[PDB]
Design a protein around this nucleic acid. Structure first.
Ligand SMILES: [Zn+2]
Ligand SMILES: [Zn+2]
Ligand SMILES: [Zn+2]
Length: 88
DNA sequence: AGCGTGGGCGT
DNA sequence: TACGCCCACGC
């Protein structure tokens, strides 16, 4: 597809289809972290990454292993993916 | 293993 | 613009 939103930061060649995609990416350059955890006051560049971070404080693990007699659960989907891959 | 985080992707 | 899924990489 077409990607009209190009990043002009020094030595960056990243380009995107949407303007929010560019603005999100550019936070990696500036170090801006607009989202703060209300529990430990750590700051984050993104709201979705703040959300999964908060689960470290509560121990909430919404993603359970489907293998029989395996009670392993995880805070994020990608953790479960790696776990399921492990089970062969 | 647990999680920061960069990017794709949808709504 | 926001919101929050997924996937992968690299500690
Ligand atoms: Zn850039
Ligand atoms: Zn926190
Ligand atoms: Zn398992």
């Amino acid at each position: 597809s077409e990607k009209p939103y190009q990043c002009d930061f020094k030595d960056c060649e990243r380009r995107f289809s949407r303007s929010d995609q560019l603005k999100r990416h550019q936070r990696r350059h500036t170090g801006v972290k607009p989202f703060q955890c209300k529990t430990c006051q750590r700051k984050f560049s993104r709201s979705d990454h703040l959300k999964t971070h908060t689960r470290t404080h509560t121990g909430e693990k919404p993603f359970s292993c489907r293998w029989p007699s395996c009670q392993k659960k995880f805070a994020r989907s990608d953790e479960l993916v790696r776990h399921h891959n492990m089970h062969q």
